Each structure stands twice: as C-alpha cells, then as structure tokens.
Amino acid sequence: RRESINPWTLTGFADAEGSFGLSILNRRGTARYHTRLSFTIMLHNKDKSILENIQSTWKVGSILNNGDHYVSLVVYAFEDLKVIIDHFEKYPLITQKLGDYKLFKQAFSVMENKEHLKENGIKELVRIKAKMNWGLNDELKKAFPEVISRERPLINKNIPNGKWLAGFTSGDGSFFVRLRKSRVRVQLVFEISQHIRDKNLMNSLITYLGCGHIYEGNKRSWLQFRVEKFSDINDKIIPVFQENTLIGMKLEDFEDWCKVAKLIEEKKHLTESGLDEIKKIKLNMNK
DNA sequence: GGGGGCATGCAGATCCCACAGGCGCG
DNA sequence: CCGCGCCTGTGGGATCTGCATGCCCC
Ligand SMILES: [Ca+2]
Ligand SMILES: [Ca+2]
Ligand SMILES: [Cl-]
Ligand SMILES: [Cl-]
Ligand SMILES: [Cl-]
Ligand code: NA
Ligand code: NA
Ligand code: NA
Ligand code: NA
Ligand code: NA
C-alpha cells in the first residue's frame, strides 16, 4: 500500500527514535512482579502519520496520546513482539540500540519459555534489565543487590544502505536554511546530531557521503555530522535522499530545502527577486 | 483463583534539533 | 573587497526512557 514504509527505513527510524523497554515493577500479593516488554516510538503529533504508517506496515501496536502535543506507538502484547523481533532479526539496527534490542530479544525468550515464573527466574530478567538503557532503579537494586553488571558488547556496524540512512535522518537529522547579514547571504546546511556512544557510526557518514565534518565541542556528550559546502549539498546530499525517500515532516523540509538549492544553483539567489522567494520558502518551513 | 498478562494510560530525563556568531581563506 | 564555509557555541522541547494498576481470563 501507498502508506507502507521501506523496512530498512523503518529500522533507521527505529535507531533514531525507538526504545526497547523492560519494566519490572512490584505487584499486593507476596513478592510478585509486573513484567512488561515493550518497543516504543513517541513523536510530536504533527508526525502521527509516521506512527500510523509504521503500524500499518507491521500490523501490530497501539497508537496513544501523550499529553496534548505527543503521540506514541507502543508494541507490548506477546504475539505482537514476535513481529517486532522478526523484523529486527532481518533488518537489524546499527546504533548502540542494537544492544538494547538483543537484550530485549533475550528477555522475550526467557518469558516465552516461562522461565520468569520459576523460583529463580525473575533474577534473570533483572540481570537483563540492568544491561539495558539506564539500568536498574534504586528499588530493584535493593531487592537484587548482587546484580551489578551493566557490561554489554559495543555495537560496531556500518551504514547498511541509503534506505536506512533516510529513516535515521528522518528521525535525528535537520535540513535548514540560513540567512546571514554581513548583503543578505543564504546558506543551506545539513546536520545530524548524536550521542558520542556512536561516534564511529557518525564518523563513517563522511566516508559514506563523501563530504561533511564531525564537530564535538570543547565542553559534551553529543556530536554533529554536518555538511555546509553547497556543491556537496547539491551533488551528494540532495541525490542521496532523492533516491531514498524521507518520511514525516522532514520530507517536507527536504522538498522546501531543495527548492532553495535549485534557486542558488541557478545563481538566482543573488537576484533581489530570487532572494525574496527564499525568504518565503523559509518562512514556510517554520511550521 | 491466584496470579500472569493485557489495556491504557501517566511521569521523569536527556538527546537531540534548528539554529547563530566569529573569522580565515582563496 | 567579498562570499563561502570551517569552526565554535546552545536553548529547550521533542524525544527517549521509566512508572503505574485495574481488568480480563485461564
Ligand atoms: Ca536519536
Ligand atoms: Ca526527531
Ligand atoms: Cl507505553
Ligand atoms: Cl544511555
Ligand atoms: Cl540478589
Ligand atoms: Na506510550
Ligand atoms: Na542538528
Ligand atoms: Na563538492
Ligand atoms: Na523537522
Ligand atoms: Na541516553
């Protein structure tokens, strides 16, 4: 269907915005636990169509409101997780979140085998949870004080294809237009920010795209891959996402963005009339 | 028949996004 | 001189992540 999302683009978007959760909460009855596995993407409700298209591609998950500005797709039901696992086995994540998925998959197998009901089975879930995301809370640490290891292998993966990069960029990327006054100057920029735990992957964008720069700051837990040279934006960045379509509102930013690139390519941004259309397109992107 | 799991949420923490200014270089 | 773009810097909210529990069903 027209609303289907390329499975690599979906994995790339998951690498950007998704989250694998393992909730282990006290249940009342003596020493019983709620055990909840989940995959979640929460967005501004201006991008609810993304979540609906993902739900339509996978045929699992429930869309819910969060506040008045946000909306999330949550996959949680036991059989629904098998569809998540089957997709990610075949279209694997490449950021550090691969580690979280693999622990999530490991907890799933523990629960599918009913091992978390045996006398010494919840401790295994706690051990898995401690390695996921932000690890254990204080309460779980007090109830399982012997579970201290957060060691897990670091993920080292290459960008698999442009479909993945389109999904990743649709999440964590940015296409914007700069105007600077010395004459009013125009500048197209492309940037992706990311936590330094994936510094190798972000570094590799320079090779994979044949342009750009990695900036880190002298302060900083996150870095930026950025392209500021116009001919790199025109000859390398724009063709890559023409071949691999972005999703959500960022595709609209891109389409507006390229319209500015066409104007500047024709040198028609120097024209006072050409610059005035650039200001209009930019005012439209602010929406 | 107690719990395991679902349905359906709410709440906290931070990693992003969409930028701006200074300035050298060709 | 001039325009490009390398390089530094960042506010704050859209993300990422964690927390909650009554109901259903075997
Ligand atoms: Ca991200
Ligand atoms: Ca995003
Ligand atoms: Cl949820
Ligand atoms: Cl983290
Ligand atoms: Cl223990
Ligand atoms: Na949710
Ligand atoms: Na950015
Ligand atoms: Na170039
Ligand atoms: Na956007
Ligand atoms: Na984090």
Whose CA is nearest the C1' atom of nucleotide C18?
A: A23
Stated in angstroms, how far is A32 CA from B9 C1'?
21
**Residue (of A277, A193, A188, A112) closest to A202 by Cα position:** A193
Integer Cα distance of A106 and A100 in angstroms: 10
**Angle made by CA atoms A221, A223, A226, in degrees to the nearest 5:** 170
Cβ neighbours of residue A278 closer than 8 Å, sequence gap 6 or more: A177, A179, A186, A260, A263, A269
Nucleotides of C under 7 A from a protein CB: 2-10, 13-22
Cβ neighbours of residue A177 closer than 8 Å, sequence gap 6 or more: A186, A187, A188, A189, A257, A260, A278, A281, A282, A285
Note the ligand closest to the C-alpha atom of A64: 6
Cβ neighbours of residue A103 closer than 8 Å, sequence gap 6 or more: A20, A22, A128, A129, A131, A132, A152
Stated in angstroms, how far is A134 CA from B3 C1'?
29
- Whether any strand B atom is under 7 angstroms from the Cβ of A82: the reply reads no
**Residue (of A238, A256, A251) closest to A53 by Cα position:** A251
Stated in angstroms, how far is A215 CA from C25 C1'?
55
Cβ neighbours of residue A55 closer than 8 Å, sequence gap 6 or more: A61, A63, A73
Q: Are A285 and A258 in contact (CB under 8 A)?
A: no
Stated in angstroms, how far is A282 CA from C14 C1'?
21
Cα–Cα distances (Å) from A220 to A96, A158, A194, A197, A198, in that order, read 18, 24, 11, 12, 14
- Whether any strand B atom is under 7 angstroms from the Cβ of A284: the reply reads no
- Whether any strand B atom is under 7 angstroms from the Cβ of A220: the reply reads no
- Whether any strand B atom is under 7 angstroms from the Cβ of A55: the reply reads no
**Residue (of A217, A213, A176) closest to A196 by Cα position:** A217
Distance from residue A248's CA to the centre of ligand 10 (Å):
24
Q: What is the resolution of this structure in A?
A: 2.4
Note the ligand closest to the C-alpha atom of A146: 5
Integer Cα distance of A97 and A197 in angstroms: 10
In the structure encoding, which two tokens stand for residue A278, read together? 């650039």
Method: X-ray
Question: What is the SS3 string spanning chain A?
Answer: CCCCCCHHHHHHHHHHHEEEEEEEEECCCCCCEEEEEEEEEEEEHHHHHHHHHHHHHHCCCEEEEECCCEEEEEECCHHHHHHHHHHHHHCCCCCCHHHHHHHHHHHHHHHHCCHHHCCCCHHHHHHHHHHCCCCCCHHHHHHCCCCCCCCCCCCCCCCCCHHHHHHHHHHHEEEEEEEEECCEEEEEEEEEEEEHHHHHHHHHHHHHHCCCEEECCCCCCEEEEEECCHHHHHHHHHHHHHHCCCCCHHHHHHHHHHHHHHHHHCCCCCCHHHHHHHHHHHHHHCC
Distance from residue A177's CA to the centre of ligand 9 (Å):
12
Residue A81 amino acid letter: L
Stated in angstroms, how far is A229 CA from B26 C1'?
14
